[PDB]
Write a protein that holds these residues in place. Structure first.
Motif, mmCIF file in Angstrom:
data_model
loop_
_atom_site.group_PDB
_atom_site.id
_atom_site.type_symbol
_atom_site.label_atom_id
_atom_site.label_comp_id
_atom_site.label_asym_id
_atom_site.label_seq_id
_atom_site.Cartn_x
_atom_site.Cartn_y
_atom_site.Cartn_z
ATOM 1 N N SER A 133 0.757 -1.283 -0.142
ATOM 2 C CA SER A 133 -0.059 -0.079 -0.102
ATOM 3 C C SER A 133 0.806 1.289 0.232
ATOM 4 O O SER A 133 1.856 1.351 0.540
ATOM 5 N N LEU A 134 0.275 2.361 -0.816
ATOM 6 C CA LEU A 134 1.254 3.796 -0.846
ATOM 7 C C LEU A 134 1.452 4.311 0.620
ATOM 8 O O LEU A 134 2.497 4.713 1.028
ATOM 9 N N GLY A 135 0.449 4.008 1.520
ATOM 10 C CA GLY A 135 0.571 4.387 3.088
ATOM 11 C C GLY A 135 1.721 3.513 3.736
ATOM 12 O O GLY A 135 1.950 3.936 4.927
ATOM 13 N N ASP A 136 2.373 2.708 3.292
ATOM 14 C CA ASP A 136 3.301 1.842 3.847
ATOM 15 C C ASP A 136 4.828 2.060 3.335
ATOM 16 O O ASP A 136 5.799 1.898 3.874
ATOM 17 N N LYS A 137 4.816 2.926 2.506
ATOM 18 C CA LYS A 137 5.878 3.346 1.718
ATOM 19 C C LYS A 137 6.458 4.956 2.189
ATOM 20 O O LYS A 137 7.443 5.136 2.374
ATOM 21 N N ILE A 138 5.080 5.833 2.331
ATOM 22 C CA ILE A 138 5.223 7.054 2.995
ATOM 23 C C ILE A 138 4.245 7.340 3.846
ATOM 24 O O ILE A 138 3.383 6.700 3.734
ATOM 25 N N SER A 139 4.476 8.376 4.746
ATOM 26 C CA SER A 139 3.429 8.686 5.605
ATOM 27 C C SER A 139 2.345 9.808 5.130
ATOM 28 O O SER A 139 2.574 10.623 4.271
ATOM 29 N N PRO A 140 1.054 9.347 5.402
ATOM 30 C CA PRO A 140 0.120 9.961 4.828
ATOM 31 C C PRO A 140 0.117 11.524 5.656
ATOM 32 O O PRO A 140 0.875 11.794 6.204
ATOM 33 N N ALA A 141 -0.637 12.609 4.962
ATOM 34 C CA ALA A 141 -0.538 13.773 5.531
ATOM 35 C C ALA A 141 -1.221 13.904 6.777
ATOM 36 O O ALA A 141 -2.167 13.378 7.154
ATOM 37 N N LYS A 142 -0.561 14.801 7.780
ATOM 38 C CA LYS A 142 -1.244 14.873 9.072
ATOM 39 C C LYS A 142 -2.217 16.041 8.903
ATOM 40 O O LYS A 142 -1.867 17.022 8.387
ATOM 41 N N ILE A 143 -3.357 15.576 9.384
ATOM 42 C CA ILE A 143 -4.608 16.458 9.250
ATOM 43 C C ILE A 143 -4.539 17.445 10.719
ATOM 44 O O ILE A 143 -4.450 16.897 11.517
ATOM 45 N N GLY A 144 -4.685 18.720 10.213
ATOM 46 C CA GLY A 144 -4.734 19.728 11.464
ATOM 47 C C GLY A 144 -6.137 20.303 11.325
ATOM 48 O O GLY A 144 -7.085 19.144 11.258
ATOM 49 N N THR A 145 -6.386 21.500 11.547
ATOM 50 C CA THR A 145 -7.720 22.130 11.676
ATOM 51 C C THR A 145 -7.548 23.457 11.185
ATOM 52 O O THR A 145 -6.644 24.447 11.166
ATOM 53 N N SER A 146 -8.710 23.920 10.280
ATOM 54 C CA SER A 146 -8.854 25.184 9.853
ATOM 55 C C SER A 146 -9.284 26.260 10.811
ATOM 56 O O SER A 146 -9.307 27.242 10.733
ATOM 57 N N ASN A 147 -9.598 25.816 11.937
ATOM 58 C CA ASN A 147 -10.190 26.619 13.285
ATOM 59 C C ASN A 147 -9.193 27.814 13.635
ATOM 60 O O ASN A 147 -9.524 28.717 14.148
ATOM 61 N N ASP A 148 -7.810 27.489 13.371
ATOM 62 C CA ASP A 148 -6.810 28.497 13.849
ATOM 63 C C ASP A 148 -6.610 29.681 12.766
ATOM 64 O O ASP A 148 -5.697 30.248 13.123
ATOM 65 N N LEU A 149 -7.129 29.581 11.533
ATOM 66 C CA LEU A 149 -6.986 30.308 10.469
ATOM 67 C C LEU A 149 -7.316 31.730 10.724
ATOM 68 O O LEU A 149 -8.519 31.761 11.179
ATOM 69 N N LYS A 150 -6.686 32.768 10.279
ATOM 70 C CA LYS A 150 -7.191 34.116 10.431
ATOM 71 C C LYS A 150 -7.065 34.741 9.236
ATOM 72 O O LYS A 150 -6.146 34.456 8.283
ATOM 73 N N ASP A 151 -7.883 36.011 8.999
ATOM 74 C CA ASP A 151 -7.638 36.724 7.829
ATOM 75 C C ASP A 151 -6.104 37.077 7.692
ATOM 76 O O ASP A 151 -5.387 37.497 8.380
ATOM 77 N N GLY A 152 -5.653 37.164 6.365
ATOM 78 C CA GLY A 152 -4.154 37.593 6.198
ATOM 79 C C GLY A 152 -2.905 36.609 6.344
ATOM 80 O O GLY A 152 -2.082 36.842 6.008
ATOM 81 N N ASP A 153 -3.664 35.507 6.735
ATOM 82 C CA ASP A 153 -2.585 34.278 7.074
ATOM 83 C C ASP A 153 -2.068 33.688 5.556
ATOM 84 O O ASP A 153 -2.721 33.592 4.745
ATOM 85 N N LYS A 154 -0.626 33.456 5.618
ATOM 86 C CA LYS A 154 -0.203 32.968 4.309
ATOM 87 C C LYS A 154 0.059 31.351 4.509
ATOM 88 O O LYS A 154 0.836 31.073 5.767
ATOM 89 N N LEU A 155 -0.401 30.728 3.647
ATOM 90 C CA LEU A 155 -0.182 29.131 3.703
ATOM 91 C C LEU A 155 0.424 28.774 2.334
ATOM 92 O O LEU A 155 0.531 29.431 1.246
#
Length: 241
Positions: A133-155
């Motif tokens: 499985s692909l997940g056994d070759k590389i690590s899946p993306a760690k899921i965070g949260t959009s709750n901490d996002l503010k206007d003007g933030d650069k991502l």
């Protein structure tokens, strides 16, 4: 809305679409090089190919699960044999393709597990020709949260801008705006960017790019993505595999 606000928007939007994409400053848009394409979080990003239909982006979030847009999954018309996922794929300027982790066929498509109103879909992959499985070759993306996002933030938005260059991963710096109306932001994207992952400084996935929607008035646009909140997170936990 006011004219002063509109003028301001036009100037900012013009920074990304006022010049040819090949002339954009590197800090705003650039190609992810060979070394980086094999590092986290770049390697969790892949090309979602729908035979004879479209070529977009997807993010690995489970051992065999890829997160992408519902409008992209719809092109397959429920038939998983028409879809394939290629993580860190790269077709150089000479037309030579390289797939460091191989290519994956699709086992099942969950077109709208979050609801038809949410532009997200889950794609279940089959293991490679060796049973890994692909997940056994590389690590899946760690899921965070959009709750901490503010206007003007650069991502950082990472994906495959097909319309600009085929099968070449690029990063686009985005700037959040008017979050009271959803995850909207300034930045350079093309149709192929559908399904692109939006990561914060810690390398956590906080959103998925969707498309461009009207902004301020009918004659103006802005980028639109789906934020990852409690609801989205829960469904992912229930369906991940």
């Amino acid at each position: 809305v006011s004219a002063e606000e509109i003028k301001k928007h036009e100037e900012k939007w013009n920074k990304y679409y006022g010049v040819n994409a090949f002339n954009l400053p590197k800090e705003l848009f650039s190609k992810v090089d060979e070394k980086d394409r094999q590092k986290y979080p770049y390697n969790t990003i892949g090309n979602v190919f729908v035979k004879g239909q479209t070529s977009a982006t997807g993010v690995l979030i489970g051992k065999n699960t890829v997160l992408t847009n519902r409008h992209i999954a719809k092109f397959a018309n429920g038939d998983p044999s028409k879809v394939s996922f290629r993580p860190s794929i790269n077709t150089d300027d000479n037309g030579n393709t390289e797939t460091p982790y191989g290519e994956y066929e699709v086992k099942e498509i969950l077109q709208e597990p979050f609801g038809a109103g949410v532009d997200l879909a889950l794609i279940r992959l089959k293991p490679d020709q060796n049973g890994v499985s692909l997940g056994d070759k590389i690590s899946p993306a760690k899921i965070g949260t959009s709750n901490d996002l503010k206007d003007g933030d650069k991502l950082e938005l990472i994906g495959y801008p097909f319309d600009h260059k085929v099968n070449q991963m690029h990063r686009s710096e985005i700037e959040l705006t008017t979050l009271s109306r959803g995850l909207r932001y300034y930045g350079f994207t093309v149709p192929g960017n559908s399904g692109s992952g939006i990561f914060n400084s810690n390398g956590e996935l906080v959103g998925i790019h969707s498309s461009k929607v009207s902004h301020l008035d009918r004659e103006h646009q802005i980028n639109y993505g789906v934020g990852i909140g409690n609801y989205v997170k829960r469904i992912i936990n229930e369906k991940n595999e």
